[PDB]
């Protein structure tokens, strides 16, 4: 019985591959040619944020484009006004081994988690004048790798037990479980309208998920190793990925196949983080060789470098208005660039 | 004569080298590095004292060149006070640094409570006050002595008594040479014995190379101190004990030995800051 | 006071 | 969150007395504290400020030299020491908390107050009207002006509105000219220019009767405009 | 157990195969023209003058 | 100063936060951080009992020094993703059970795990404390059954003396970084406080080496 099912699976895979090949007629490179290059891109350090005493793992910008939160190995969460380098809040964490953090769109809450296997929710605005923990989400059986808020009462998480989840913050229960991956899920990215999301895992594949229905609609393959980072394109019809094979790739939803590859022979280390600019003309990636590279999205040219850190570039982010870029590293410093 | 030019030229060369080295050390600690560790707090103070100590030579060159004090009495009095303060402060900082290195290594667990940055700042503030207090006689009774249209700055002593000279030379010898040397030597000997005992540091050839380097640097520091300071004291002691007829060669030997007492300040940054591995990355980044 | 040609850091000519 | 204050009573001239306030229900060590007074039929007058951590202290010129302000953080207590009391010191004294960071609301909680009876280059604020007659269900507008521009180079206008209902301590309504305080209905709105300001009530309700006050926070000393009373 | 997993994989792959697909040329032509139309308002492609930059000093 | 009253209050609050962060860091620097690794049924629980989710943390104080132990047995996920977090520990304690050679066999599993840990890039200068457990049952068992089941080459007598040494040298052969690190090997005694003493002795040398590096003498 099992052999017949295996035969049916392999036949269906050949079908899907044939259909994808039939769609492909011209490449992006041919289409986006004979158009002027962006030219050299140069940016400078505007601010230096000092105060963590260990490795930094995560950062996330607030929706006003002025405030931000950071997480470090020392058990501290810090909120930073970025025009004046002032400290708004410092939060002590119960468990030191933290891997991710998030900022709510309203501005009222923050979340963090890690090797304790729990997601914690912190209320920023109270009548006693101090920050306190509001919720602890305890379902997962592996470590937490990422989290993002949809509103003030729903959050979505990923874990090292190969599963994603959707939560109801008020009741503390899981509403939907996403279970299709075979390796540790490392990263998630939400769509602009919030009806869909994409995830990347250690089995070297990416999946597209439907929030309301709870099902997997599409699977994307092509990398040769662990996918560490994933981000949505601004109109919501494409996404990009970065892996341990020292490459980045672009995938189109409606054509359901790969569009372009970003790599250079000099680079042989992995990629840790990825992001787009306001119009999506530039792609920005952090590396393990202490540097950030800047890429033309439509062409596959290197346009610039951000060479300012003494150890690994763990995290990066771009503001909603499009004004500044933030980078965090394992040397304990956060830099702002423009 | 011919000797005066060479002496003045050597004086200027020493002053320039000392100012460049001390300035570069302070420029690096203040910016690229920081003063989080106890060691960095102790090194910056030494650098500041040496830099201030190196700005008093030009007057002494303007006096060796022509045998007369061109400036006024008040300025020379100020110069004597400053030179004395800086000299004693540098010697005391060296002794403090050696005691700290002995406590960290020989008694690592017990000393943990004692070693904190606040206490280190307290120690430094104490050191400057003691240095200011010990130099009082020089500031009180310094003046000018002229006999001919030629003057010189010197320490006039009340009552024209030939004993104040001996009682000053003994005082400076006891508090400026013997005691610091016995302390530094005892601390470094006990450090070498302890390091020989530790199992994790000994037992392989590549490890024995590092033990050899530790011994080499410890020996070098003591050798430089003794070489740079013994001739001054021996010359002064001989002069106070016995009458010496003035001769030109004696004039050139006296001036050269006095200039030699400032090489220690030029050599302090290389021994404590440049060789240190901790500072190598900061120097690399700065330049 | 009494003149010692060599004392401290100076040579006094008498 | 309660602040209870004590001391006061009847004092003879040329005397000394100390007043106290005890705090409960909040993180007391994180807030700066202020003392403010009101004479028997006059308006509000600022007295003194002590910051969080005790680094900064300020006093009014009228009282400087004779008053001392202190805090005890483990006991959660605030104190005011007064000496050489004058006839002009007869008043009701109040305690106010304030916290300062980006996006906060200073002057949000006031205390009940205590009464002392003694036996026997500053920015001016102008409120030009009093005793405006009105009836429930109608809109209203109130205007306050200044002798100097309250707009700063950073981008903020430092104007505040307060309401004192009969028999009660003051309450914050609008901070920094355009923002609405927590727990306050959306009827109220604040708008203004560099030197002229207005407060608008869309539909009046019975509870809205009392006195309205404007304040500036650009510079120290802090200065209060006279009142403006809504009757019925 | 193992048969159940094989059945689930077969069902999933069947569901994924049905989706309709547009040509690559159209999708590329629709990404090329999202960046023509939003390029005037991107502060990183072209540096804005110091007057409007909130991170001057 | 071109600043307002509220801007100055904000700057003062920020400096009162920097102070507290520096104090907490100074307190944290003195603590001793230990990592605990072992295969299942290796005697870890006996060590944990005698000395005082996804991770379990234990703390105790012995002779004026403060100890924090972390156990990561229950993670059951890919180790490469999270192992780099523990760079910077003072030392690693590895537990092995001597009786588990009859029962591939568990001993080869333990040797594979020890080899993979020891030669890791992250842990190049980290000292390893090795505990060999269950002396008693090993001594009874070895009589009945010879050691040749686990090891074909062994020629020595089937007695405790030669077997213990042969196993010790088998584990010590795996080290390939002899210059930078020392492997401390102990035969665990159940009813004693010798184990804690042994650990304290081993960590003292690490502290001395750290202080030599910081001072600049080394």
Coordinates of C-alpha atoms in Angstrom, one line a residue, chain E residues 21-48:
Chain E
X21 CA -0.7 30.4 -12.5
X22 CA 0.1 33.6 -14.5
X23 CA 3.1 34.1 -16.7
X24 CA 6.5 35.3 -15.3
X25 CA 6.6 38.2 -17.8
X26 CA 3.4 39.8 -16.4
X27 CA 4.6 39.5 -12.7
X28 CA 8.0 41.0 -13.5
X29 CA 6.3 43.8 -15.5
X30 CA 4.1 44.5 -12.5
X31 CA 7.0 44.7 -10.1
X32 CA 9.0 47.0 -12.4
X33 CA 6.2 49.5 -12.3
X34 CA 5.6 49.6 -8.6
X35 CA 9.0 51.1 -8.2
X36 CA 8.6 53.7 -11.0
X37 CA 5.6 55.1 -9.3
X38 CA 6.9 55.3 -5.7
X39 CA 10.5 56.3 -6.4
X40 CA 9.9 60.0 -5.8
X41 CA 9.2 59.4 -2.1
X42 CA 12.0 57.2 -0.9
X43 CA 14.5 59.0 1.4
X44 CA 17.2 56.4 0.8
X45 CA 17.4 56.4 -3.0
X46 CA 18.1 60.1 -3.0
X47 CA 19.4 62.0 0.1
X48 CA 17.1 64.7 1.3

